[PDB]
Every structure is written in C-alpha cells, then in structure tokens.
Design a binder for this molecule. Sequence first.
Ligand SMILES: *C(=O)c1cc(/C=C/c2cc(C)c(O)c(C)c2)cc(N(C)C)c1
Ligand SMILES: *C(=O)c1cc(/C=C/c2cc(C)c(O)c(C)c2)cc(N(C)C)c1
Lengths: 115, 115, 115, 115
Amino acid sequence: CPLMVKVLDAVRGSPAINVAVHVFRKAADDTWEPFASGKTSESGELHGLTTEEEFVEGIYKVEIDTKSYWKALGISPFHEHAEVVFTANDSGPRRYTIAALLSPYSYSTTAVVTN
Amino acid sequence: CPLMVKVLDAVRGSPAINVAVHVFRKAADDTWEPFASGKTSESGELHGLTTEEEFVEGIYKVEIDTKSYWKALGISPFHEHAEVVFTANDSGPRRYTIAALLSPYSYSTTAVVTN
Amino acid sequence: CPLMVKVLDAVRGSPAINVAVHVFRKAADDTWEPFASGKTSESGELHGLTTEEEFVEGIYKVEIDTKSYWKALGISPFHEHAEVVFTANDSGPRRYTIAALLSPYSYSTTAVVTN
Amino acid sequence: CPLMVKVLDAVRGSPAINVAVHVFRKAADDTWEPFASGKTSESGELHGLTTEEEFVEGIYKVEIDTKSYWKALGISPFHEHAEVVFTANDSGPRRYTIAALLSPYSYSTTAVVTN
Ligand SMILES: *C(=O)c1cc(/C=C/c2cc(C)c(O)c(C)c2)cc(N(C)C)c1
Ligand SMILES: *C(=O)c1cc(/C=C/c2cc(C)c(O)c(C)c2)cc(N(C)C)c1
C-alpha cells in the first residue's frame, strides 16, 4: 500500500471517520487529473487508493474534504479543504502516509515516507 | 488590512523570512485567478495584500511557497507548497490572519478572525 | 520584553482571551519555583512577565491553564494544562515568544526566538 | 493496551525512533510518582506501558524526552521535553493514544481516546 491517508479530530479526540479524500496527479499539460478517491474508515484510515504500478513519479495533490466533515457535526469551519501537494517517487518507489489533525479553524499535516 | 499572512519556521524557531505568498480568488468558471502576492518580511508577515473594497465574499486560496524556502536553507522538503483555501464571509466587520508554522515534512495552519 | 506568551484558539479562530499562564524557574533542588504569571489579553498575548535583568539563563516552565479555558466555553477538554519547558540561553541578545494553538484534545506550541 | 504513545519526526518525515518516554501519576499528596517508562520502537510506537488493572483513575503526565532525541541527530532543540498531562479513566476505563509530532523548536500533540 504505497499511499495511505490518516485523519484525526482534535475536538473529539477520535479518528475522523467518513472523511472524503480526493487524490489528483499533475498531467504533462500542467492540469490536475483525478487519480483516486475514497473515505476514511472507523479508524480514520484510507487504504487501497492505488497500487505500486499505478503510483508512478509525479506531483500529487491529496484533497481532504474537511468542510463536509465539520458541517456534518454542526461546526461551520474555516477551510474548504486541506490540500497536501508533493512530489512522489522521484528517487524510486516509496510508501507515503499523509496524516492530518483537524480543528474547525486549523489543521496540521505531516508525511511519513518509508522505503 | 483585511487579510494578513504570518509564517513561522519550526526548525530555526524564527519568522519565515522572504517566503513567497500568492493569493487567488475562485472565478465563476471554477478556475483560480491571481489576486495578490508578496514576500514575508523580516518578522514573517505579509500585509497590504488587499483592501476592504476589493476583498469581497468568495473562495480564496493562499499558496505559501514552502519548497523554495527550505531549498534556500539547504533542507530537503516534502511539500511543493502549503495551500490554505477558505470562504471569506461578510458576517460583521472582520480581519483574517492566516498563520502557518513550517517544518520540512509538516505544516500547521490556523485562521485568526477578529472584529 | 524578553518573554512573551501568545495563545490562539483553533475551535473559534480567535485569540485565546483570559487564559491563565504561570511561569516557573527550576531551582537548584530541582523543584519548580513560581517566577511570573498573568492572563492573556483580548489579543491572546501576555507581556510584562519579566525583565532582561531577572530573566537569567536557566530552565523555565510555561504552564497554560487550558482546562479552565475550555470549561469556560462549555467544551470538555483532554489536558489539565499545556506545559512548555525550555532552557533560556544567553547566546547574543534575544526575545522569546512562546506561542500555543489550542484545541480540546490537542495543542501545538512553537518558540519564536529573535534578536 | 490502554496507554500507547506515538511519536513522529516532522524534519525527517519518519517515525521518531528510540525516544524515551516517562509516565507519572499524581499521588494523594500531590507529588508525581513514577508510573511507567519505555522507548519508541522503529515504528515510533511505545506499547506495553501498563495494564487495565494498574491504569486506574488519576492525573497522568507523559514526558516525552524530545531534547535527548534531537541532540542524537545534531540539533540543539528548544524544549527540554514535551509534557502531556491529563485525567484518565474518570468515566471508566478508556484506551488512550498520545501522539506527538516533533520539530526542533515546536511540537504538536493530540490524544485519541476510545471506549
Ligand atoms: C499513523 O501514522 C498514525 C499517526 C498518528 C498521529 C498523527 C499526528 C499527530 C499529530 C500531533 C499531528 O499534528 C499530525 C498532523 C498527525 C496517530 C495514529 N494513531 C491514532 C495510532 C497513527
Ligand atoms: C499573530 O497572529 C501571531 C501568531 C503566532 C503564532 C502562530 C501559530 C502558532 C502555532 C503553535 C501554530 O501551530 C500555528 C499554525 C500558528 C505568533 C506570533 N508571533 C511571532 C508574535 C504572532
């Protein structure tokens, strides 16, 4: 599993469940092409977005739909989404975990990159 | 000043100086139009991006050029940029401060919205 | 002002107003001696804790009374307080800003150390 | 496993490995008593600190020895440690994950609390 997304809720102290995630890959013409999508599980995790074969070198954008999440809990939040934009695999295949910690007017994101 | 950007460096414990910032407004055709830009000061701040008159309700994107900042310090970073996307809503008088705290593989962002 | 504390609220998108802050210095017997205290202002800031003369090298603890802040907003929080413990080192002239970004189950803290 | 600690490195984009963690529990006389200790694994995780039987209601302090960690990588960091202080089990047994994301002059911490 070369690309995993983990989302936590800093208000509830819980995984952020049923958070929609859209992944895009920049195409040769500099447009964002849809790559993969899914939603976080009861553990706040999203696995199975892509495969080692399909996850080639490129610039990827991980869009985490935080506004839809907060709205469903009665919070009118600040951000539309949290966007994580990075070059992947440019020194060969790596495994990437994109983690996000959400609050209504703030978020933090990190990456864990393993060989 | 309706819109200020503040950038801090979590590796040096300092303001993040000379960081390029680009602000975009979402157009009717759902494309991102350039709106304002500049470079953070010696205090990590960027003021004077826009005016009360021009900063109407809409969806805005603040792109912080973190990759060039880390490259200038000789540190390999993860992200291409940090992106903060939000709706500006006129409910009363308000000032938006977008703050970001940068690390090579992580960032934190918050909004300080005041009257 | 050698030592300033700044507190932000990640749920409201605001300064964290009227937060009690206690500063301690580590004594020779390895106990924490009260040093300075106060409450954040309407801008989330606490100035005037100490002087250049009194703020000598040593180990300091900044305790931020987050639990009382969340209780006053009717929100169940995780932590008893947020604690920032650091050594003050005289290398050149410097000002320490301790910043904290609060959520009910999370906090972020950074140091901005300037000349 | 009712108390787990997870530590990430925001500079390297990796688990924070071999981070020492000390847990204390406030005694009736308001002193901190040693409760448990250990170090993070190659995954940045510390399991097996306590048992459901021993982890009774109380105020706990999780001290993460971040200064020792950074010093071993050639970084003179700001903080002495990251301290996470909380009341545990006061509505019955819960499972607690204390997560921390480290930078030289900053850290973020959150808790995931499950029934
Ligand atoms: C898996 O990698 C993982 C990660 C985390 C925590 C991530 C995290 C912590 C903090 C303090 C942040 O600011 C960010 C952005 C991420 C937790 C877990 N759990 C819940 C076991 C797994
Ligand atoms: C003014 O608004 C301001 C803000 C801050 C710090 C911001 C900040 C801290 C932490 C811990 C974060 O995680 C985030 C995202 C933002 C500091 C200052 N200074 C430098 C006076 C001013």
